[PDB]
Amino acid sequence: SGSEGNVKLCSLEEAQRIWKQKSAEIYPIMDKSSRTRLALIICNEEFDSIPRRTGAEVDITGMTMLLQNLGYSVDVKKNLTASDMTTELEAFAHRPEHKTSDSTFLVFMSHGIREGICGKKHSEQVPDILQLNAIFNMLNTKNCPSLKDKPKVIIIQACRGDSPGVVWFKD
Amino acid sequence: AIKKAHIEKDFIAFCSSTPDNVSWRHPTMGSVFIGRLIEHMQEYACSCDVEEIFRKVRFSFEQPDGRAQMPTTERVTLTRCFYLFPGH
Amino acid sequence: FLTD
């Protein structure tokens, strides 16, 4: 039904109204004919000691198709330890396609705690955790010079602790 | 010659809940935040920049519904609007 | 529904 699927299109009219309104305040887009956009999805569903994240395959399907719709070539990696996630992020940062890209998306989906994202072998006795800080460090201008000046969007589906996130008030 | 660049710039992160708090998932419909993000990107990528889309996603969570959660934007160093220009 |  088209490359963009269910993503509503920006008409060329709508693109020119945006483009000269905030002209010098918009990230530049590369020619569609030659650019090589990449995105990375890391999803942990089956764990050695933590309950299985049923429904994760729906998330992978939806986010993979969405990112392809927006023009990204999507790598999907599943069921990684935190060390494996680091190795894969370093490999993603080194990809030559980033030099002829204008942006990137990274999506992480797992169990989580306050400190960060759980790897497949995480346990209370032996934690296996990737911190958001490490993700930023691996993709910054020093460690990923190919993405200098380009937007890097990081999406994280995970708990950030055990609390319900609510308080009561009197109506 | 060499020139100096900011070591950290042009990032945005979007998390499914606020610090200390849980995020919800359904076995058949998937993770609530991911589905909500997909719906909003499909509807609004054509007209809104990424920071504005994420704000609309937060707004859609504003009313707790038994499984309250509030997605949070973190560590933002975008210096420009990021428009995705779908179709171009 | 379950939590992550």
- Which string of DSSP letters, residue by residue, matches A11-42? -HHHHHHHHHHSGGGB-----TTT---EEEEE
Residue ranges making up the domain that contains A9: 1-171
Contact B69, B33 (CB under 8 A): yes
| C1 reaches A (C-beta below 8 A) | no
Cα radius of gyration (chain B): 16
Dmax over Cα atoms in chain A, in whole Å?
Answer: 59
A58-62, Cβ contacts within 8 angstroms, sequence gap of 24 or more: A58/B28, A58/B29, A58/B30, A58/B31, A58/B35, A59/A109, A59/A157, A59/B30, A59/B31, A59/B34, A59/B35, A60/A109, A62/B30, A62/B34, A62/B35, A62/B38
What is the CATH classification number for the domain harbouring A92? 3.40.50.1460
Chain B CB contacts of C3 under 8 Å are 22-25
Contact B50, A152 (CB under 8 A): no
Give me the residue label for tokens 């088209």.
Answer: A2
Residue A124 to residue A136: CA distance in whole angstroms: 25
| A116 reaches C (C-beta below 8 A) | no
For chain B, list the domains and their CATH numbers: 1-88 (3.30.70.1470)
What does chain A come to in residues? 171
Entry resolution (Å): 1.8
> Identity (one letter) of the amino acid at B57?
V
Active site residues of A: 111, 159
Residue A12 to residue A103: CA distance in whole angstroms: 21
Give the DSSP letter of residue B77. Answer: -
A-contacting chains (≥3 CB pairs under 8 Å): B, C
Chain C CB contacts of B31 under 8 Å are 4
Chain A CB contacts of C2 under 8 Å are 51, 54
CA angle A25–A30–A34, rounded 5-degree value? 180
Cα radius of gyration (chain A): 19
Q: Which helix (H) or strand (E) holds A57?
A: helix A56-69
> Identity (one letter) of the amino acid at A74?
V
Number of structural domains chain A divides into: 1
How far out from the chain centre does Cα B67 lie? 19
Contact A121, A169 (CB under 8 A): no
Parallel/antiparallel/unpaired status of strands B24-26 and C2-3 = antiparallel
Cβ contacts of A92 within 8 Å, gap of 6 or more: A38, A40, A75, A106
CB atoms under 10 Å from CB of B86, counted, come to 21
